[PDB]
């Protein structure tokens, strides 16, 4: 594998082996008064600042230099340019990778197979805006002449997680927009409980699927269309209540959707990088087009930062490199994303797809297997909730867990003269301070003594009160979570994931690993019909199917 | 540490080292036709069956025997009896651990400090039921004489995650109940966006806090009380709209809550094991008391299973032991919980607290540090959504991830003559079959050739289509997700966590690891007031505070 053969990677690993025991955050801070100044970056976007403070990490200047040299040795910059230039870097599928074109507000030509994609990107944006205006203003009427009050996006994975995460995060910007609902699971609970709350006369369904063949989505769409037709009783009414977001014109037509109701995207838009395309239509309907354009513009700002900033001061690059250090040197399996913002409650779940489906890979560009770790397991919940759920293990378990803590300085709801937000900030700051500093045996002993504990009681309780600390974090603090800032932050992590994938020599843009399960489910589906025992698989699959058939009947 | 000194643990580790490379799931199945029969358990609760199929695990009969011998050697059974008998097994806090008493429908006496706790458990249950009847029937009126239409639980961690997870899971059973809302984050967004949707005349607030001093909860409660009083303008009206769930009578009174409006629980109810107590009041209000009693009864059934079944056929014990094998022998950091049920969308998040706050520990009963792994990082999302988010990494990444797949045979919404559920089941079955079987180079080559790929194209794409498989899973399938069955399933995992904690020699029932962050946040809170630069902490904490103060002013 390329990474393990790289001499800069070998140098980094040898240094880690030689100097690991010497890395202690407390000591690093007392030895360098300028530690925060030297291991942080501030990004001024002109619409808010982003402080990326990576100083509470187990790194020195020498480590950061070696990591930057690794990025250079692995050709990160040339790979980056291939992406932005429309070269077919998704080599297993023979596709370009151009989510950056979707938000290219500068409109510089970006060629795919010699043809600039910008005119079509902009044509779809204009179509989205025109449709959005009609719907939001009440000009677009349902089959009985009423305005649309509810928009239901039907889609799964990349056709669901982005729009849901962004509409949740930008809820304060939804004045005057219809309610939005996201139906994604094939589990019939999802569509059933949603339809029960809706009036077909005032509901608009958005069928979101890159291929337009995804089983869960098409089945959900058909269920919705049947429910709609039970009320409307006229196939022509479908054109007032169903639109499609897809790359497949043919399948959209076959489904019965009016061709003028199709909002197109392209093969070079990966689903987990698709919210910036037509897939973002539910975002624009909920928060308006100006806000959607601000979201794209924030991403564009970050794209320019990533593309033109020297590596040593390039935010996505440094976040990526710190991750390489923890993954490939320290061996940490996971990466926690902990936004101290309830509106961002689905941010970690979004990056679970963005990061894990991109970099949970093991075949390199040369077709050989990696002999080192690749993408981490990403997880998290918003602060402060997580403090009361799982931080016990982060502070006093046996796992090393790099965490990114994120927060806006300004809240959307400064209630009680800002008291809630002041407490939120204090916890955000205290948690990373605590993770770094810990509390020694003697510090804890002093506290217990001052609290009046007896010798016998102190001796028994004391060991449990000790915190080893030395647990590294990034703190990412930004002025306010506006549409623009959210766009910049999401693009920042997109690019972090890109850089890690290039260093690992894997393809961040395909997803061949989902195929086998789809294949096997198609074989099992028909076997579930009827009372007959199934014997065609391994004994477990057979046993489970037979139990399912036995219990289908039970009355409980 | 006790575990590493245990001879059965040493024997298990040596066998693992000697025979690891020989463990292959495909081969284990073709060598044992009775493999499913011999590595599965069926539980018949009289209100549904639970099939625990652990046959797709990297174990043989010898491994299971050794694991059971380890449970015996570590004294799991005697520890279990100490828990059920009310002994103070939470040794660091000097408390009993009696969530099992909360649902002890058999009413056998359970003593704490010599006194049976059952009369008080039942007195509170009766008080909950009486209050619930008044509220749900409309007999309990708000300050203007209207019936209550909305119940808002204010609480965090153990006072939030259980009731929210259970009301979400049991949504079909909420006919005739008021709407329920959960406010938990201190982030002012949470309470602000909730209050904006409510009428003070018809809203009942439940302040849920074991100590009644948790900063987030009390601040949220005060904000709610202020909003309420702005409308009601009479402190006496608070008694019609605010109740408390707590152990602290004194603090409840000081807050201004009528003493008859306090639903008590006890020090031996851990927050992450509290939904079965007074903390479950919002559950009972939403789904009714009969359903809440069925939930407790399901838990009671599982408690009796755990307490009286020989270890080798005891479901929580075997789930625990398989976890010990993957954690302490294979070194897997994480454990994924993947319910194929949208109603269970917050189940994995609930067990993130239940498991990680219990067993994310490193000090043993002897006060010495563990020299082995303890609790895993728990994570997950419901199927099939997760297939389209992160399963790429489970199938083709570089991490070994034990997964529990769960599903009900019968759906609450059998729409389209059961089509959605049939597809859901087919995916549930196919995914674990795929994780086990994989797909070899030659199998993938055959497929590509049959699809008409040219030699050059096949050669390049082929390696990316290979699945190594051998990825172990548990499949837990139950008749239907009713209140009773949900109670049995939650108790099953409570007991799994108990068994793991005893094997590791840690205290599953305290949480000293949350203290340091609380301490440090209290110091930082006042420092955030005013324009002055802060220099009292490490350079990072100072730098972050100073950036926050600089940006507080920015207009974006």
């Amino acid at each position: 594998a390329a990474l393990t053969r790289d001499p800069q990677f070998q140098k980094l690993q040898q240094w880690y082996r030689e100097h690991r025991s010497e890395l202690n955050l407390r000591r690093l801070f007392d030895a360098n008064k300028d530690r925060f100044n030297h291991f942080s970056l501030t990004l001024n976007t002109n619409h808010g600042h982003i402080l990326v403070d990576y100083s509470k990490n187990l790194v020195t200047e020498d480590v950061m230099r070696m990591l930057v040299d690794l990025a250079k040795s692995r050709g990160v910059e040339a790979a980056r340019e291939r992406m932005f230039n429309g070269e077919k870097i998704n080599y297993t599928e023979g596709r370009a990778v151009l989510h950056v074109a979707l938000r290219n507000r500068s409109n510089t030509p970006i060629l795919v197979d010699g043809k600039d994609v910008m005119p079509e990107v902009n044509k779809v944006l204009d179509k989205m805006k025109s449709f959005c205006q009609r719907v939001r203003s009440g000009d677009w009427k349902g089959y009985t002449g009423k305005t649309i009050t509810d928009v239901i996006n039907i889609g799964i994975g990349g056709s669901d997680l982005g729009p849901l995460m962004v509409t949740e995060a930008l809820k304060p910007y939804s004045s005057g927009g219809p309610r939005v609902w996201y139906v994604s699971n094939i589990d019939g609970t999802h569509i059933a409980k949603t339809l029960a709350q809706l009036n077909p006369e005032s509901s608009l369904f958005i069928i979101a699927s890159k291929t337009f063949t995804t089983q869960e989505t098409i089945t959900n769409a058909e269920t919705a269309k049947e429910w709609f037709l039970q009320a409307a009783k006229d196939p022509s009414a479908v054109a007032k209540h169903f639109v499609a977001l897809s790359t497949n014109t043919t399948k959209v037509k076959e489904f019965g959707i009016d061709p003028q109701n199709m909002f197109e995207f392209w093969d070079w838009v990966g689903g987990r990088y698709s919210l910036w395309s037509a897939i973002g239509l539910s975002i624009a309907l909920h928060v308006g087009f100006d806000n959607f354009e601000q979201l794209l513009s924030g991403a564009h700002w970050m794209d320019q930062h990533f593309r033109t900033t020297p590596l040593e001061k390039n935010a996505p690059v440094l976040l990526a490199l710190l991750g390489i250090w923890y993954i490939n040197c320290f061996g940490c399996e996971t990466h926690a994303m902990l936004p101290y913002d309830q509106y961002l409650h689905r941010f970690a779940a979004y990056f679970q797809q963005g990061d894990m489906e991109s970099n949970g890979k093991y075949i390199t560009k040369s077709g050989t297997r990696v002999d080192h770790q690749t993408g981490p397991i990403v997880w998290g919940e918003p602060g402060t909730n997580g403090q009361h759920a799982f931080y016990q293990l982060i502070h006093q378990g046996t796992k090393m867990i790099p965490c990114d803590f994120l927060i806006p300085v300004q809240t959307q709801h400064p209630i009680r003269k800002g008291l809630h937000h002041k407490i939120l900030l204090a916890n955000f700051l205290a948690q990373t301070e605590a993770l770094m500093r810990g509390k020694s045996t003697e510090e804890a002993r002093k506290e217990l003594q001052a609290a009046g504990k007896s010798p016998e009681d102190l001796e028994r309780l004391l060991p449990h009160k000790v915190f080893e600390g030395n647990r590294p974090t990034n703190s990412i603090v930004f002025t306010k979570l506006t549409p623009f800032m959210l766009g910049a932050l999401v693009a920042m992590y997109e690019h972090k994931i890109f850089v890690q994938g290039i260093i690992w020599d894997i393809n961040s843009f395909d997803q061949w690993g989902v195929e086998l399960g789809k294949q096997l489910a198609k074989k099992i589906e028909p076997e579930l019909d009827g009372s007959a025992q199934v014997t065609s698989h391994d004994a477990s699959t057979n046993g489970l199917i037979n139990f399912i058939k036995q219990q289908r009947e039970a009355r409980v």
Side-chain angles (χ1 to χ4, degrees), chain A:
Chain A
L3 176 62
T4 37
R5 293 182 74 85
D6 179 281
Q8 294 296 338
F9 181 72
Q10 292 172 5
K11 172 178 179 194
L12 185 75
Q13 281 219 128
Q14 178 65 25
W15 191 101
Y16 166 79
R17 177 179 78 153
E18 294 164 342
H19 307 279
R20 179 200 195 265
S21 81
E22 287 146 55
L23 294 172
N24 181 273
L25 294 176
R26 287 241 315 185
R27 305 190 199 116
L28 286 167
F29 276 92
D30 39 59
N32 186 1
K33 36 253 55 176
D34 264 65
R35 185 167 177 91
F36 167 80
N37 292 336
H38 284 351
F39 296 82
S40 65
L41 302 178
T42 301
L43 278 30
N44 174 13
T45 71
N46 298 158
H47 302 286
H49 288 62
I50 307 172
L51 170 54
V52 181
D53 175 3
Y54 57 95
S55 70
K56 302 196 191 69
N57 283 115
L58 294 165
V59 299
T60 59
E61 293 283 10
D62 284 343
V63 177
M64 294 308 299
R65 276 195 20 253
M66 284 185 290
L67 288 166
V68 166
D69 286 348
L70 175 65
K72 292 186 180 177
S73 187
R74 297 291 305 116
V76 167
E77 290 169 301
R80 178 193 61 210
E81 295 312 295
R82 288 190 72 217
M83 176 168 61
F84 278 88
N85 290 331
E87 301 182 36
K88 294 180 187 170
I89 66 164
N90 174 358
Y91 41 86
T92 64
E93 294 182 304
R95 295 173 180 177
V97 173
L98 279 178
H99 40 281
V100 298
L102 300 172
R103 63 247 192 168
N104 178 21
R105 307 307 294 171
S106 298
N107 285 148
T108 49
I110 299 175
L111 313 180
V112 173
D113 288 314
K115 186 179 181 117
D116 181 13
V117 301
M118 295 310 304
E120 282 290 313
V121 163
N122 290 147
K123 181 188 213 310
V124 173
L125 288 168
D126 287 344
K127 186 188 174 62
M128 291 166 71
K129 181 177 187 166
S130 174
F131 176 73
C132 189
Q133 288 173 142
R134 293 165 68 199
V135 175
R136 278 167 65 91
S137 67
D139 283 3
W140 181 285
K141 310 291 190 184
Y143 71 95
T144 67
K146 301 187 160 181
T147 59
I148 297 299
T149 54
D150 295 270
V151 170
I152 303 86
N153 188 81
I154 297 180
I156 195 163
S159 293
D160 164 73
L161 255 19
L164 180 168
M165 178 275 287
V166 173
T167 53
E168 286 297 298
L170 300 183
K171 202 56 72 167
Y173 299 92
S174 66
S175 161
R179 283 176 294 261
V180 286
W181 305 76
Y182 290 93
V183 168
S184 52
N185 205 329
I186 181 65
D187 180 358
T189 287
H190 215 175
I191 191 58
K193 73 185 183 77
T194 300
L195 296 176
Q197 298 176 260
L198 298 170
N199 180 339
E201 306 187 21
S202 50
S203 295
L204 166 70
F205 292 90
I206 298 181
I207 308 312
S209 173
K210 178 170 184 186
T211 56
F212 227 70
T213 58
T214 299
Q215 191 176 212
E216 295 100 323
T217 298
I218 299 301
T219 298
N220 274 326
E222 289 186 330
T223 289
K225 185 169 75 211
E226 176 186 77
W227 169 90
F228 173 80
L229 285 171
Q230 285 172 2
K233 295 189 226 181
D234 174 9
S236 304
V238 168
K240 301 180 176 308
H241 291 265
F242 285 73
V243 300
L245 316 180
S246 190
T247 69
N248 199 318
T249 304
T250 296
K251 270 93 164 47
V252 164
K253 302 181 292 102
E254 297 171 357
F255 177 79
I257 276 163
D258 189 342
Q260 293 168 119
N261 278 2
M262 183 181 312
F263 296 85
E264 195 170 3
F265 60 113
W266 306 277
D267 72 358
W268 41 255
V269 177
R272 60 190 175 269
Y273 298 98
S274 74
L275 70 87
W276 318 100
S277 74
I279 289 293
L281 183 68
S282 62
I283 299 168
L285 285 160
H286 200 223
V287 303
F289 217 77
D290 282 359
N291 286 146
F292 183 68
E293 288 182 325
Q294 289 157 216
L295 172 78
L296 298 173
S297 299
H300 192 231
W301 188 94
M302 184 60 66
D303 290 342
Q304 289 162 281
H305 169 83
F306 173 51
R307 193 165 191 182
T308 61
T309 300
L311 300 173
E312 68 270 12
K313 292 183 176 174
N314 187 312
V317 169
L318 295 183
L319 293 173
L321 287 172
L322 289 161
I324 295 300
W325 178 237
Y326 296 126
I327 288 162
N328 296 294
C329 289
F330 284 89
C332 298
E333 288 192 27
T334 79
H335 188 257
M337 291 174 70
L338 306 172
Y340 273 57
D341 184 274
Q342 187 64 208
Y343 281 136
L344 285 172
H345 70 123
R346 302 306 294 162
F347 188 77
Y350 176 84
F351 277 109
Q352 211 165 44
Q353 185 177 189
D355 193 327
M356 301 172 71
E357 196 176 64
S358 291
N359 292 166
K361 298 287 165 61
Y362 78 120
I363 306 304
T364 65
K365 188 161 79 290
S366 75
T368 52
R369 282 178 302 161
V370 298
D371 56 0
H372 50 84
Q373 290 297 314
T374 55
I377 292 162
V378 169
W379 60 288
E381 286 288 346
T384 58
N385 296 72
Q387 297 171 20
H388 303 263
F390 53 73
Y391 281 31
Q392 162 69 46
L393 186 152
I394 304 179
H395 285 280
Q396 284 190 329
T398 56
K399 273 74 180 167
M400 179 179 182
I401 303 168
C403 295
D404 290 348
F405 279 69
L406 304 101
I407 199 173
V409 175
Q410 300 176 18
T411 178
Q412 296 285 346
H413 299 280
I415 60 176
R416 310 270 313 273
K417 296 178 36 76
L419 176 68
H420 285 242
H421 205 58
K422 178 197 180 172
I423 294 168
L424 186 67
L425 285 159
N427 285 90
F428 169 95
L429 297 159
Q431 287 291 330
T432 65
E433 182 187 24
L435 284 167
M436 163 161 67
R437 82 130 46 211
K439 181 187 300 187
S440 70
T441 295
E442 165 61 14
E443 289 179 292
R445 185 210 57 77
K446 176 106 249 208
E447 287 180 352
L448 289 172
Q449 192 205 155
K453 295 264 153 31
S454 66
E456 23 286 307
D457 286 354
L458 194 155
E459 181 164 277
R460 287 170 284 206
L461 179 55
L462 179 51
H464 300 275
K465 301 211 56 143
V466 174
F467 287 73
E468 291 185 319
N470 212 19
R471 285 154 157 80
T473 55
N474 287 143
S475 287
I476 299 166
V477 181
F478 43 91
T479 303
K480 192 173 187 174
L481 190 66
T482 57
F484 179 97
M485 181 60 66
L486 175 61
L489 292 168
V490 178
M492 184 176 70
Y493 276 100
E494 290 182 334
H495 296 322
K496 170 196 173 182
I497 288 161
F498 172 81
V499 173
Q500 295 185 142
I502 297 307
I503 291 172
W504 291 321
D505 212 47
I506 56 163
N507 186 177
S508 293
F509 303 108
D510 61 11
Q511 57 287 316
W512 292 111
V514 308
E515 193 165 8
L516 181 55
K518 286 178 193 181
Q519 292 177 298
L520 297 189
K522 290 314 293 161
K523 310 313 99 73
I524 289 166
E525 190 180 339
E527 298 177 326
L528 291 176
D529 295 324
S531 59
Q533 281 207 3
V534 169
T535 59
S536 55
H537 306 260
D538 65 88
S540 171
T541 299
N542 294 339
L544 289 159
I545 287 170
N546 295 327
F547 179 81
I548 287 159
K549 294 194 183 199
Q550 165 187 259
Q551 294 295 132
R552 155 172 156 162
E553 327 196 274
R555 284 289 181 153
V556 291

